[PDB]
Design a protein around this ligand. Structure first.
Ligand SMILES: [Ca+2]
Ligand SMILES: [Ca+2]
Ligand SMILES: [Ca+2]
Ligand SMILES: [Ca+2]
Ligand SMILES: [Mg+2]
Ligand SMILES: [Mg+2]
Ligand SMILES: [Mg+2]
Ligand SMILES: [Mg+2]
Lengths: 129, 145, 145
């Protein structure tokens, strides 16, 4: 197109196109800011899901053994002048080991040794009786 | 998935971030543009965004990285909702229409230099239904162009 | 509204922390009991539970209330899938592996931040082989077992 009329149409179309491009430049930039804004919130939410699951795991693994131990001693417990004094002597010994765990963090193995001691002495007191 | 046309609309948007034309950006330009469009990212949030895509650890990133940075597993209604928030960055006062004053507000924050007559050139070109404003349908049509 | 077998296991746990036996514990202990029972609220969720059961500022929680909470939390719970998916977000390359250091940075700087020492404890478990690289799919199955 070399005509002076065609060329004026051209300048109109090109001027329109440019305007439609200034729009898309700022609109798509607007959409970028939005998308970025959401990436930050997407990444935070996923971070928090890792964080909470870790807080939980860190906590459970410290205390579950101590609950389990507690239960073990607590079950044992559930299971006239001479016999009673020898057995009440065990309940009190149990409630003591049960208060020990409820009052001081201790390893499953430590709990286990104490528990084993309670079982042996207790089997001998329920075998005689 | 992005079509080449969309990447190209995006490449243009990138130029508002990468003002100096070297083809790369830092959290500095990330935060500047974002803040000028209403957002309030913290430095920590910006630094993290970068880390995900800053392969060579330069602290600097480029256009393909900039695009991956904007990606994430989205929901069903999420694309449409983002277009709506993009609208509401212009329609700041939430009446459902972009007016000239509102267009200029954004153009000024982004630092575009233009005369009041050009801004009206812009409203006029997008204003299909001819009411002196820009509704959501028309803004979308323009974005799509 | 909870299995006799369930309510029983909770009391088993609730009673480790209630030394005196008044069926009461401290508000700070709430999180420790929920977590031992395998629940995983966020710090904000905890603070909400406390702000609605501690109007009188006494800082006590009794078994009844603790059950009420253990029933709300149980109705809105993240599957192992979801938590793995959350980890995946921080896997630049999709390997199924993230570097210890990458994990430490995200988590001591975003979200509800962890202490360095808490993270130290996780790395000790999550990167057993000391190559400074965690397979999160395995670490998550473990945590949630
Ligand atoms: Ca640059
Ligand atoms: Ca880079
Ligand atoms: Ca408006
Ligand atoms: Ca209009
Ligand atoms: Mg008490
Ligand atoms: Mg109370
Ligand atoms: Mg990786
Ligand atoms: Mg490892």
């Amino acid at each position: 197109k070399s005509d002076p009329d065609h060329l004026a149409e051209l300048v109109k179309r090109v001027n329109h196109w440019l305007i439609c491009s200034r729009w898309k430049k700022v609109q798509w930039c607007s959409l970028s800011v939005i998308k970025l804004k959401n990436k930050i919130k997407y990444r935070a939410e996923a971070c928090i899901k890792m964080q909470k699951t870790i807080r939980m795991w860190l906590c459970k693994r410290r205390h579950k053994p101590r609950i389990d131990g507690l239960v073990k001693v607590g079950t044992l417990k559930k299971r006239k002048q001479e016999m009673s004094k020898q057995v009440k002597d065990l309940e009190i010994s149990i409630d003591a080991l049960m208060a020990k765990i409820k009052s001081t963090m201790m390893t499953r193995e430590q709990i286990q040794k104490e528990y084993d001691a309670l079982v042996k002495s207790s089997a001998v007191l329920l075998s005689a009786l | 998935q992005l079509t080449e046309e969309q990447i190209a609309e995006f490449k243009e948007a990138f130029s508002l971030f990468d003002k100096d034309g070297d083809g790369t950006i830092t959290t500095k330009e990330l935060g500047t543009v974002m803040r000028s469009l209403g957002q309030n990212p913290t430095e920590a949030e910006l630094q993290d965004m970068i880390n995900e895509v800053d392969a060579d650890g330069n602290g600097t990133i480029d256009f393909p990285e900039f695009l991956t940075m904007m990606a994430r597993k989205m929901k069903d209604t999420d694309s449409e909702e983002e277009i709506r928030e993009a609208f509401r960055v212009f329609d700041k006062d939430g009446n459902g229409f972009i007016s000239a004053a509102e267009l200029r507000h954004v153009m000024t924050n982004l630092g575009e230099k233009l005369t009041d007559e050009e801004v009206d050139e812009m409203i006029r070109e997008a204003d299909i239904d001819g009411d002196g404003q820009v509704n959501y349908e028309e803004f979308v049509t323009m974005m799509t162009s």
